[PDB]
Each structure stands twice: as C-alpha cells, then as structure tokens.
C-alpha cells in the first residue's frame, strides 16, 4: 500500500489567503522556517499506478502537478485517478471535483447522507452530470467494508465519526450518522492496516480498540491548544470547528497516542495557527520526541 500526502494543511491551507497571524505573517516575511501546505488530502494505491483520491481539495490542481504518478501519460487525455472517496460533504473536501469535470466519469465513494448534500445544498453531482456521464455514486454503507476495482488489494472499512454536516446542509441541525466518517484501509495482500482520521473529536473504547490493530495512525493535528483560535485571535470557535481536539493535553492527542508506540503516528490536517508549523519551535520538538511525525506536502508513507 502506497500512501501519498497531497495536502496536509486545513481549511484555508497554509498560509491562509486572508490570515496575517504569526505563522502566516511570518512565513510570508521569510522570518519563520516553515513550508507552505495545501488543503488536507491523501492518495492511496496498492500498485502505485492506480490511485484512489481521498477527499478532493480545492488545491486539487497544484496537488496533482506535484505528484508524477497522478499523470502516467499513457495516452492523450489520461489521469492517474481511478476513484475518489468522500469522508464528508465539506466545501474543502469536495470542491476539487469541479476541477476534474473535464475528465469524467469518476467513481465517487460516499455515504447516503453525503450524497444527499451533494445533490442539494452543494449539487456537485447534479452540476457535473452534464459532463460525459458525470459522477457514478458508490454508496458507503454504515456497516461493513468496500473495495474499488482499480485497487482490489485495498480493503476499506469506514468507522462512524460523531460529527455534524456543513452549514449549507439541509440537515445541518439534524446530525445523522454517515455525515463525517474516518477510514480504516487494509492491504489484503500483506495484512497492513492504515488508520486515517484527519477529523477527530475525541476517542473512545471502540476507537482505541481498533486503533491498536493498525500499523499506521494518521490522526489529525489541527490545533496545538484547544483554543488556538483564541490565542492567535483569528477565530471564534474552539475545539469543535475545522479539526478539533488539541494535542497539548491532557485528554489530548499527544497523550492518547502514547499507548501506540509500536506503530507510525503522523499528524495531518494542520491548521495555520498550530505552532507545530514552525520548524525550530518548542511545540514542534515535543511532537518529534514523542515519536510523532508532522505530515507535510509531498510526504510518501508506505507499509508493505
């Protein structure tokens, strides 16, 4: 199984178009060691030639250009994508599709709740249907596992992730399971298991239980402190909107990860406010020492 990190930032990526905070005002000022990041998004494959896109970010164009396998040039008008999985119906996880319209049809994998939002509040499916077949919806049942034709060696098993639909959803006040869910990918050939959850509110008994059975833990590292938005003074919300659950602890990520030493633990979906975006920073050190790698654009994780 080949895991490619196309995007590693969050929300407005990094630096954010309209944010002049420490990390952003800093990065632009050349007075801060850090690397720009596009909206979180990873690709998956078993043969390294056929890839399944996980969440289509608004930085889809640049992200594809930066990865050669996304363009095998095995023929004029050809792509390295064979299917896309949607973990929710957020704008920053589905806007990319609009940019893939010139290459339809695409096999989109998403629950019924998400497919509902994508045919109503944000009619990506309706819109694109006017583009050579459009998108072929593939339901992601709330129970069980699925497998895509392009990569028959990858076994997907999505787990429920207590969350709420985007503000444009016809049921934003009526949270149904299937709105936002994590992913458990297993390489049926070797047995390897990747635990992907760029969106985590708080772990429980059922989560941790299945986490230990994973070789690689790709959890979200949005904010260092539950109220990063408060210190930086750029946001109102806290530990709830756009990747929650800080890492500082207690009850934090860095803490819960401690019970997972025999496995690769990486932090993806980093917000522009997170201090772990500063190479030579104190909070960065704590993450490295704890044995947790901070995801970055271009990163290539593999299990085999």
Is 271 a binder of Zn ion (CB under 5 A)? no
Measured between alpha carbons, how far is 183 from 275 in angstroms, rounded to an integer?
Answer: 27
Q: Binding a copy of itself by CB under 8 A: which of 101, 155, 171, 176?
A: 101
133 binds a copy of itself (CB under 8 A): no
Q: Which stretch binds a copy of itself (CB under 8 A): 207-215, 230-238, 250-258, 280-288?
A: 230-238
Task: Take residue 38 and report the two structure tokens written for it.
Answer: 């596009």
Burial status of residue 275 (CB atoms within 10 A of its CB: 0-12, 13-18, 19 or more): buried
**164 touching a copy of itself, by CB under 8 A:** no
Q: Which does 272 bind (CB under 5 to 8 A by kind): Zn ion, a copy of itself, none?
A: Zn ion
Residue reference for tokens 């059975």: 213
The span of 117-125, 149-157, 281-289, 295-303 binding a copy of itself (CB under 8 A) equals: 117-125
Q: Return the closest-CA partner of residue 183 out of 199, 204, 163, 202.
A: 199
Site string for Zn ion, 222-261 (x = CB under 5 A): ----------------------------------------
Least Å distance, CB 76 to a copy of itself, is 5
Q: Using the rule CB under 8 A, is 59 a contact of a copy of itself?
A: yes
Instruction: Pick the closer one to a copy of itself by CB: 89 or 158.
Output: 89
**For residue 81, what are the β-bridge partners?**
51
Instruction: Answer yes or no: are the C-beta atoms of 57 and 40 closer than 8 Å.
Output: yes
Edge-to-edge order in the sheet of strand 51-54 = 135-139, 106-110, 81-85, 51-54, 41-45, 2-7, 300-302
Cis? peptide before 250, omega within 30° of 0 = yes
According to the binding rule CB under 5 A, does residue 24 interact with Zn ion?
yes
CA-to-CA dists, residue 2 to 51, 112, 230, angstroms: 9, 28, 38
Binding residue count for a copy of itself, defined by CB under 8 A: 47
Helices (H) and strands (E) in the chain, counts: 9, 13
Stretch that binds Zn ion, among 1-9, 15-23, 55-63, 205-213 (CB under 5 A): 15-23
To the nearest whole angstrom, how small is the minimum distance from the Cβ of residue 211 to a copy of itself? 32
Q: Which does 122 bind (CB under 5 to 8 A by kind): a copy of itself, Zn ion, none?
A: a copy of itself
How far apart, in whole angstroms, are the C-alpha atoms of residue 165 and residue 177? 10
Is 21 near Zn ion (CB under 5 A)?
A: yes
What DSSP designation does 251 have? S
| C-alpha span between 67 and 9 (Å, rounded) | 17
> In the structure encoding, which two tokens stand for residue 205, read together?
């008994």
Task: Report what 102 binds from a copy of itself, Zn ion, none; CB cut-off 5-8 Å by kind.
Answer: a copy of itself
What is the contact surface with Zn ion in residues (CB under 5 A)? Answer: 16, 19, 21, 24, 272
What is the contact surface with a copy of itself in residues (CB under 8 A)? Answer: 11-13, 15-21, 25, 28, 58-62, 64-65, 70-71, 73, 75-79, 91, 95, 98-103, 121-123, 126-127, 130-131, 167-168, 232-234
């Amino acid at each position: 199984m080949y895991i490619q990190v196309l995007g590693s930032a969050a929300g407005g990526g990094f630096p954010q178009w309209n944010c002049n905070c420490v990390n952003c005002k800093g990065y632009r000022d050349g007075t801060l060691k850090a690397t720009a990041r596009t909206q979180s998004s990873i690709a998956l494959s078993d043969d390294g030639v056929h890839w399944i896109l996980c969440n289509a970010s608004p930085d889809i164009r640049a992200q594809l250009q930066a990865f050669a396998p996304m363009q095998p040039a095995r023929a004029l008008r050809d792509t390295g994508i064979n299917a896309i999985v949607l973990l929710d119906s957020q704008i920053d996880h589905t806007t990319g599709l609009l940019s893939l319209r010139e290459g339809c049809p695409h096999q989109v994998w998403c629950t019924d709740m998400v497919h509902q939002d994508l045919t109503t509040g944000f009619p990506l499916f309706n819109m694109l249907s006017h583009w050579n077949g459009g998108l072929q919806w593939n339901r992601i049942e709330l129970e069980g596992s699925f497998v895509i034709d392009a990569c028959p060696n990858l076994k997907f098993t999505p787990f429920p992730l207590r969350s709420a639909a985007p503000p444009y959803s016809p049921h934003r006040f009526d949270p149904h399971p299937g709105d936002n869910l994590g992913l458990m990918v297993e390489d049926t050939r070797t047995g390897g298991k990747l635990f992907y959850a760029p969106g985590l509110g708080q772990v429980d008994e059922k989560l941790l239980a299945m986490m230990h059975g994973a070789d690689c833990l790709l959890v979200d590292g949005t904010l260092w402190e539950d109220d990063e938005m408060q210190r930086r003074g750029v946001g109102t919300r806290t530990g709830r909107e756009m990747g929650h659950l800080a890492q500082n602890g207690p009850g934090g990520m860095l803490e819960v990860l401690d019970g997972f030493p025999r496995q690769r633990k990486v932090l993806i979906h980093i917000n522009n406010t997170n201090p772990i975006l500063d190479e030579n920073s104190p909070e960065r050190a704590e993450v490295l020492r704890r044995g947790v790698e901070v995801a970055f654009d271009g990163m290539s994780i593999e299990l085999l």
